[PDB]
Write a structure and sequence with these properties.
It is classed as transcription. The entry lists the keywords PanDDA, SGC - Diamond I04-1 fragment screening, bromodomain, epigenetics, XChemExplorer, transcription. The chain has about 180 residues and is mostly helical. It has two domains: about 60 residues, Zinc/RING finger domain, C3HC4 (zinc finger) (Herpes Virus-1, 2-Layer Sandwich); about 120 residues, Histone Acetyltransferase, Chain A, CATH 1.20.920.10. The protein contains seven helices and two strands; from the N terminus they run ββααααααα. Strands 1-2 form a two-stranded antiparallel sheet. Strand 1 and strand 2 form a beta hairpin. Helix 3 runs antiparallel to helix 5, helix 3 packs parallel to helix 6 and helix 6 runs antiparallel to helix 7. Bound molecules: zinc ion (3 copies).
Length: about 180
């Protein structure tokens, strides 16, 4: 097993996956690491098993169809993994916790959003469709773009949204296009 958390790349109190070499802090893993379960398989392993059980699940899909899916167990898991993949980028620290807005010449967004809130929402089963999760994720970066305007700090929004979008296309097997 690894000696650092796969998500935040620090040492500490780590839980080890029994079926791959990754390790996690308790609350870096999504969902949080389960109390018992021996053996324990992490989210990367669980996502790999889905693919192996249904190899056709990797054929191309339309984004519009993916968004309308109901949050059954397997879509729930995919959304948790996609959220995890964003937290894996150290630039997610800017979007994790509840933001505030007091900048000359800007007004704050009508509907603030942050990664920990989406985390909570997923954990409490508040999303009924994939569309709900994806809207809130994209709202995070859109609020950032709009508020920071021509400050070069807007680029953090672009960069973390690219991580999100690439991972979304990968995890939900969106049809490749030019
Ligand atoms: Zn960690
Ligand atoms: Zn694993
Ligand atoms: Zn099958």
């Amino acid at each position: 097993n690894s000696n650092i958390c796969e998500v935040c790349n620090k040492w500490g109190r780590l839980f080890c996956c029994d079926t791959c070499p990754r390790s996690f802090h308790e609350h870096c893993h999504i969902p949080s690491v389960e109390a018992n379960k021996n053996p324990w398989s992490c989210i990367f392993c669980r996502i790999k098993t889905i693919q192996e059980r249904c190899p056709e699940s990797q054929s191309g899909h339309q984004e519009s169809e993916v968004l309308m899916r109901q949050m059954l167990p397997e879509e729930q898991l995919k959304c948790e993994f996609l959220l995890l993949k964003v937290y894996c980028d150290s630039k997610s620290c800017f979007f994790a916790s509840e933001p505030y807005y007091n900048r000359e010449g800007s007004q704050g967004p009508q509907k603030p959003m942050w990664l920990n809130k989406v985390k909570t929402s997923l954990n409490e089963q508040m999303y009924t469709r994939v569309e709900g999760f994806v809207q809130d994720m994209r709202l995070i970066f859109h609020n950032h773009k709009e508020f920071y305007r021509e400050d070069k700090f807007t680029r953090l929004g672009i960069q973390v949204q690219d991580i999100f979008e690439k991972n979304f296309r990968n995890i939900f097997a969106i049809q490749e296009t030019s």
